[PDB]
Amino acid sequence: STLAENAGLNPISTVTELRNRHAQGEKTAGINVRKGGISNILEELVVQPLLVSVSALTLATETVRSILKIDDVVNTR
Amino acid sequence: ALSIYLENYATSMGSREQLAIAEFARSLLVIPNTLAVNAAQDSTDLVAKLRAFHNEAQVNPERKNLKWIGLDLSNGKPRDNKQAGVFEPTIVKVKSLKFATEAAITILRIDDLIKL
């Protein structure tokens, strides 16, 4: 929805349309900012490695779990 | 001249760009509108007279329709610059439109300010 907003598209209808294309299709459906709309990203040759998406969820969730476990902060001296 | 062409070109593209190209067309009229005010004349009329002679060139190529009509500041009337000899380099009008476009793009991308 942030990519769709930056590409001038509607943030809701873009992800709302893609959630149906993923239920019916595969992960090839994604936002193409070069053309300004939804397209088959597998054909556009716009890919990224797997470690970026995996390490993102891994490190982000650990930070959220760490922030969630903060009950309070103490000021020492 | 670009005020009429780009306004017609905007109707061909669409896709959330018809209004922007139309405003780009209307923005160029500030130059003849500003030159008319500095020449102590009614800018609304002279700007309208330029766009009429230039629009008639687009409707058909017949010779009865005047072409390449400029703006004479002294007499306060449009004049054909080919006869009057009011010429400028091509790179000026080309670079000035390119640099002015890149500047507005550089400022439109600014949606936040952080001070330190």
């Binding site: - | 109707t11 896709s15 409707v59």
Partner: protein, 213 residues
Amino acid sequence: GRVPEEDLKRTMMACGGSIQTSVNALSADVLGRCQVFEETQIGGERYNFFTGCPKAKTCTFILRGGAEQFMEETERSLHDAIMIVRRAIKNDSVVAGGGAIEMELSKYLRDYSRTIPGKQQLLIGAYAKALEIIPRQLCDNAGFDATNILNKLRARHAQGGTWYGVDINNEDIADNFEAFVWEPAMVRINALTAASEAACLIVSVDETIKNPR
């Protein structure tokens, strides 16, 4: 008894009698007439009705549905449906609705304003852009994107379109003439005239005067 006054007065104009309060003046002057009367069993309850009255310029349509909103929502749409059929028979000359005619005039006036040197150029063009509000609000009220439709709609009129307009059902442009979305041309003519005449009254005004009272 227990007949509503609206139904009684509706039968008054249909039968041609008169609703007399006191029973002392009841006579042939107020008494109505009819051709065929019968008591039916619509939905189990009895419904009286006089058919073929002398002044039978009226009728009634009984609705049925699972709730009031089925009938109330149906009530609103049928009243305009009666006017649409009432309009097509009266005036045979029509134009495409849904803002299709408003975009065609915007093309004609805008292309005409360029050939008009003077201060009338910006104003006739300003008159043209003002016609965009009719197809615009139909898209905004219908929950559609006015940008994508108006840009796709204004582009179609340039290529040769004359009846294409806004489709409230499908979020796209459609030939409102082929879709039988019509309106009377003379009724639309009186709208532009009353609009400009109303704007001219406001533009021609420059000062307001108020007697202290």
